[PDB]
Amino acid sequence: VLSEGEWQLVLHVWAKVEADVAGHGQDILIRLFKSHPETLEKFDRFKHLKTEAEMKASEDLKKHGVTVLTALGAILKKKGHHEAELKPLAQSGATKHKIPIKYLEFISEAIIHVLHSRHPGDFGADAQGAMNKALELFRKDIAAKYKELGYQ
Ligand code: HEM
């Protein structure tokens, strides 16, 4: 559980991401692929992407990055009341994609990194801790939904 004041920092931050979803989107994913390349394997559509530059130029990637932030965003504004929203993601990752929780951790890290790089002044320790929590609550919820479906 997050305190109200924590939710706010999370949401205070999200507002900045929301000003350039696509842009936050690509940095996030490129960082992820870059830092944990094995994650690139889940994506048949992106595996032919050999460099940053080509990653950046990919429209599919960029679209995919908006889809991600968009979805994450709906969850964060639910402030912990996200079952409905969460359910479909646990399902597809348990059943179609098989995304391990670890892959979720990685991603959480890229998020953090991208926010800290782009919004230093709005992402100090306090807000950062708050974002970490929020991300943790998401991963914990999903993990439980995964087990309930037979995955993990
Ligand atoms: C912040 C956490 C994430 C969110 C909100 C998120 C959201 C989504 C959404 C909305 C889709 C499209 C619908 C669906 O297939 O479920 C998607 C698709 C997918 N996600 Fe994720 N995702 C996250 C993390 C990841 C991670 C870490 C991976 C793999 C390392 C991943 C792999 C996939 C794949 C393979 C698909 C299929 C999309 C396509 O190719 O059409 N997702 N993700």
For ligand 1, whether the C-beta of 142 sits within 6 Å is no
For ligand 1, whether the C-beta of 71 sits within 6 Å is yes
Residue ranges of alpha helices (H) inside the chain are: 4-17, 21-35, 52-57, 59-76, 83-92, 101-118, 125-148
Give residue 99 CA to ligand 1 midpoint distance, Å.
8
72 and 18 Cβ atoms separated by less than 8 Å? no
The rounded distance, in Å, linking the Cα atoms of 134 and 76 is 7
Nearest to 44 by CA among 21, 30, 60: 60
Number of domains in the chain: 1
For ligand 1, whether the C-beta of 10 sits within 6 Å is no
HSE-up of residue 88 (Cα within 13 Å, Cβ side): 6
For ligand 1, whether the C-beta of 33 sits within 6 Å is no
Residue 147: other Cβ atoms inside 10 A: 11
Residues 6+ apart with CB under 8 A from 113: 31
Distance of CA 89 to the CA centre of its chain: 12
For ligand 1, whether the C-beta of 89 sits within 6 Å is yes
The whole domain housing 18 covers 1-152
69 and 24 Cβ atoms separated by less than 8 Å? yes
CA–CA distances in Å: residue 89 to residues 2, 53, 99, 113: 21, 29, 10, 23
Task: Tell me the structure's resolution in angstroms, rounded to a single decimal.
Answer: 2.2
Token representation of residue 80 = 């912990």
- Indicate which CATH number applies to the domain containing 42: 1.10.490.10
Give residue 69 CA to ligand 1 midpoint distance, Å.
10
